[PDB]
Amino acid sequence: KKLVIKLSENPLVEYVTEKEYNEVPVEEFGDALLRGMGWEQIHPDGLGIGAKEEASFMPVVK
């Protein structure tokens, strides 16, 4: 029911297969590899720390 894949602890493979994705699904692949191994916020624009249209910031007075 739950398959196990052991890695080759050490001829080419061009594409994977159009069928190995059906024999081994994507979500089942990551679970099967781990069993062989053994195992089985928002910050607005420039807002300060701790606080909760442009009006150009000129702190300069005539």
Partner 1 sequence: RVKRTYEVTRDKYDYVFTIQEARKLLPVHQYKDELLQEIKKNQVLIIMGETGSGKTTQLPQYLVEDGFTDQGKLQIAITQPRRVAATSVAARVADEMNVVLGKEVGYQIRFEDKTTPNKTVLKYMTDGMLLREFLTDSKLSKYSCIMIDEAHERTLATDILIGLLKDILPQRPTLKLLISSATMNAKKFSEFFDNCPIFNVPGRRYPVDIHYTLQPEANYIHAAITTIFQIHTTQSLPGDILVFLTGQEEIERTKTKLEEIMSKLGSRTKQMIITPIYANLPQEQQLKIFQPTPENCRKVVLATNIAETSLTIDGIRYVIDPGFVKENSYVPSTGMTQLLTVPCSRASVDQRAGRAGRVGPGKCFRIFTKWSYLHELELMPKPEITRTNLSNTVLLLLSLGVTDLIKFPLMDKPSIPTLRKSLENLYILGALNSKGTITRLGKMMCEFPCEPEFAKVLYTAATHEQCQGVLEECLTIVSMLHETPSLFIGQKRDAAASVLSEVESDHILYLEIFNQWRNSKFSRSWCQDHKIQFKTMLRVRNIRNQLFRCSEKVGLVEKNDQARMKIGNIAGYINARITRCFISGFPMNIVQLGPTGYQTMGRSSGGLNVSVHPTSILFVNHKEKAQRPSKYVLYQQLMLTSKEFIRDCLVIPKEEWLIDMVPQIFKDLI
**Rg of the chain (C-alpha set):** 28
4 contacts partner 1 (rule: CB under 8 A): no
12 contacts partner 1 (rule: CB under 8 A): yes
Q: How far apart are CA 52 and CA 49, in angstroms?
A: 9
39 contacts partner 1 (rule: CB under 8 A): yes
Dihedral of the CA atoms 42, 48, 53, 58 (nearest 10)? -150
35 contacts partner 1 (rule: CB under 8 A): no
- Which stretches of the chain bind partner 1, using CB under 8 A? 5-10, 12-17, 20-21, 23-24, 26-27, 29-31, 33-34, 36-39, 41-51, 57-62
